[PDB]
Structure 1
């Protein structure tokens, strides 16, 4: 399986960082303070692809931790999950871990492969958790930019 390291920034220029062991938060960060920003290892997995839709898995660079989508209280929820450090990543990643990376005019959107039309979203306010939102349209942010970082 092929990967690439990168950071994501929401369309409002908020950066993502590790809240506790299993949460991500988005805040406006600038300076050497930028160092506290999570670096993902984006893997190109198997699934349904288009010129526009590419299935990926998002893990933390060097941590056996992956974003996954699961129901919690009858609603799709984004969480960080630990995986056996020896079996991952894989090309055929379980569905809960797959997002469709959609390119939309220089911006990306990450939709859950498991919950159609649920996207990785951030809040307009500072310091709130990154979550799975089912609505696109003026409120929560569902678009990001990506920056390549080195291997």
Structure 2
């Protein structure tokens, strides 16, 4: 059948919101009130992959855009990018591995591990207005925990 998708927003555990802030750029900042329309709406697709009760493979597309979060090596490091795709072919159930995150539910928060790069996570910085990135530990000063808000 089709792939199933939900519209949502994400906020880091410090309650920073995610925004598009440059051609292919995702940054995190403290947002409230009028400025909250600026936040990125995701289409979270439930994709093929290894699954358990608390670990669910997803893709993260930007709502009604042919753009996906993806994990690739750049200058020899696992990095997070926004990657364009052929809009005729996406989303699909069998997303390529660079697009797949393991959505992990621990203590009422979510972590998004790269399926391609084990123990690399979607991360934010403590500082305002810095890139969303792929970080190689769910420990330390960088933030790896999120909450999801369901959108109409």
Q: Residue 136 of structure 1: CA displacement?
A: 1.9
Aligned CA-pair RMSD: 0.6
TM-score by length of 1: 0.98
Query: Which blocks of at least 5 consecutive residues in structure 1 are unaligned?
Result: none
Q: Residue 72 of structure 1: CA displacement?
A: 0.4
Q: Residue 19 of structure 1: CA displacement?
A: 1.3
SS, match of residue 36 in structure 2 = helix
Q: Residue 28 of structure 1: CA displacement?
A: 0.2
Q: Provide the rounded CA distance (Å) in 2 between the counterparts of 1:136 and 1:85.
A: 33
Q: Residue 74 of structure 1: CA displacement?
A: 1.0
Q: Report what 1:54 is aligned to.
A: 56
Q: Provide the rounded CA distance (Å) in 1 between the counterparts of 2:107 and 2:138.
A: 16
Q: Provide the rounded CA distance (Å) in 1 between the counterparts of 2:140 and 2:117.
A: 21
Q: Provide the rounded CA distance (Å) in 2 between the counterparts of 1:143 and 1:126.
A: 16
Question: 1:57-96, CA deviations, whole angstroms, 9 ceiling, x for partnerless residues?
Answer: 0000010000000000111000000000000000000000
Question: 1:93-135, CA deviations, whole angstroms, 9 ceiling, x for partnerless residues?
Answer: 0000000000001100000000000000000000000000001
TM-score by length of 2: 0.97
Report the number of matched residues.
150
Query: Which blocks of at least 5 consecutive residues in structure 2 are unaligned?
Result: none
Q: Report what 2:126 is aligned to.
A: 124
Q: Residue 21 of structure 1: CA displacement?
A: 1.7
Q: Residue 52 of structure 1: CA displacement?
A: 1.0
Q: Provide the rounded CA distance (Å) in 2 between the counterparts of 1:143 and 1:61.
A: 22
Q: Report what 1:11 is aligned to.
A: 13
Q: Residue 138 of structure 1: CA displacement?
A: 2.8
Q: Residue 17 of structure 1: CA displacement?
A: 0.1
